[PDB]
């Protein structure tokens, strides 16, 4: 209600897009122990960077395709590794989030066409789903690859991005409903 | 249970949600005409 | 076999497999083990129960 | 190249250093002994193709 | 909570929210169905 929900909608859109991009890039997802350092590390999404051992603060990229005695021949495992490496589902969530924010901003321009906002809501919901999928594939890949491990602040930022995206979808749909109600 | 063991049903759930939204959009466009 | 045939050896106790051609040149004893030609490979990794395991 | 090998341990190493691209045909006794010994990175498939006795 | 690892509980919450939002949307975005007798409790 109160007609100001567009503000919260776009603020949430920009905030969640920022959180998602920050999480995709900062390389702080997994606090664990690796033989590369073995020692402590703060691996992320694209590149691993140790914090312990002879070389501290040294960052190197991770292969995602080690010699597993033809284990990469398995169709399911190969597909999972490919998706994890490309990491296209979180990217897709960010893209959909950005497009939804763009549609919401345009709504202030083309107020005649309501379908813009419905598209925005659908985009945000789909972004939430894609973020879920990215999280699932990331975790399943890590498991597939009994030590101690823990998740970094960037992962919780991704979770916040998902929650925000779904809330925004709700608000956009409510906006569209009210507008149609008052537009007969 | 790790998440690797029970991921398939999550994939199925997400596919179902996508399918539902697609179907609803299809019905929406159809009843628009 | 050369050691026994060419006099360099008097007896032999070992994982030595019988066969016709080898038996046509030297006397033999009775079997003291059972065996057979068998395959050997590297343990394939434990395939996790794939998707649709429910 | 020639799949053959000079000695048993050479075949063991080859199968354990081939990413599962090499299969070695040896007896049923040495095979089991190896299976029981660490790191136990190998296994026996199928049944004996023929029994011979030592 | 030991029988199900922490990750599964997190993703359960995520999917509960996703499903609830999707159901709300689907049931109540098409004005055609609920325009009359304004029509659904979802
Ligand atoms: N350890 S085992 O089961 O493989 C095994 C196998 C065999 C053994 C003894 C043992 Cl312990 N001796 C017999 C021999 C003994 C006498 C009986 C047969 C031969 C002559 N041959 S065998 O059948 O090849």
PDB file of N, CA and C and ligand atoms in Angstrom, chain C residues 30-34, ligand 1:
ATOM      1  N   UNK C  30      53.470 -82.782  -7.159  1.00  0.00           N
ATOM      2  CA  UNK C  30      52.045 -82.525  -7.165  1.00  0.00           C
ATOM      3  C   UNK C  30      51.774 -81.087  -6.758  1.00  0.00           C
ATOM      4  N   UNK C  31      50.628 -80.540  -7.142  1.00  0.00           N
ATOM      5  CA  UNK C  31      50.315 -79.166  -6.756  1.00  0.00           C
ATOM      6  C   UNK C  31      50.323 -78.993  -5.248  1.00  0.00           C
ATOM      7  N   UNK C  32      50.832 -77.847  -4.804  1.00  0.00           N
ATOM      8  CA  UNK C  32      50.694 -77.431  -3.416  1.00  0.00           C
ATOM      9  C   UNK C  32      49.957 -76.109  -3.285  1.00  0.00           C
ATOM     10  N   UNK C  33      49.355 -75.618  -4.365  1.00  0.00           N
ATOM     11  CA  UNK C  33      48.488 -74.454  -4.305  1.00  0.00           C
ATOM     12  C   UNK C  33      47.551 -74.486  -5.498  1.00  0.00           C
ATOM     13  N   UNK C  34      46.407 -73.836  -5.340  1.00  0.00           N
ATOM     14  CA  UNK C  34      45.463 -73.633  -6.424  1.00  0.00           C
ATOM     15  C   UNK C  34      45.407 -72.151  -6.760  1.00  0.00           C
TER      16      UNK C  34
HETATM   17  N1  LIG F   1      45.592 -73.395   0.232  1.00  0.00           N
HETATM   18  S1  LIG F   1      44.745 -74.159  -1.082  1.00  0.00           S
HETATM   19  O1  LIG F   1      43.285 -74.258  -0.809  1.00  0.00           O
HETATM   20  O2  LIG F   1      44.750 -73.341  -2.250  1.00  0.00           O
HETATM   21  C1  LIG F   1      45.489 -75.800  -1.426  1.00  0.00           C
HETATM   22  C2  LIG F   1      45.306 -76.408  -2.632  1.00  0.00           C
HETATM   23  C3  LIG F   1      45.883 -77.662  -2.876  1.00  0.00           C
HETATM   24  C4  LIG F   1      46.612 -78.259  -1.928  1.00  0.00           C
HETATM   25  C5  LIG F   1      46.796 -77.629  -0.677  1.00  0.00           C
HETATM   26  C6  LIG F   1      46.244 -76.426  -0.440  1.00  0.00           C
HETATM   27 CL1  LIG F   1      46.468 -75.636   1.102  1.00  0.00          CL
HETATM   28  N2  LIG F   1      47.249 -79.680  -2.233  1.00  0.00           N
HETATM   29  C7  LIG F   1      46.639 -80.532  -3.366  1.00  0.00           C
HETATM   30  C8  LIG F   1      47.615 -81.914  -3.644  1.00  0.00           C
HETATM   31  C9  LIG F   1      47.602 -82.663  -2.579  1.00  0.00           C
HETATM   32  C10 LIG F   1      47.254 -83.694  -2.833  1.00  0.00           C
HETATM   33  C11 LIG F   1      46.237 -83.720  -3.180  1.00  0.00           C
HETATM   34  C12 LIG F   1      46.286 -82.884  -4.505  1.00  0.00           C
HETATM   35  C13 LIG F   1      47.215 -82.540  -4.603  1.00  0.00           C
HETATM   36  C14 LIG F   1      47.824 -83.626  -4.369  1.00  0.00           C
HETATM   37  N3  LIG F   1      46.494 -79.798  -4.576  1.00  0.00           N
HETATM   38  S2  LIG F   1      45.687 -78.438  -4.340  1.00  0.00           S
HETATM   39  O3  LIG F   1      44.183 -78.775  -4.471  1.00  0.00           O
HETATM   40  O4  LIG F   1      46.089 -77.534  -5.344  1.00  0.00           O
END
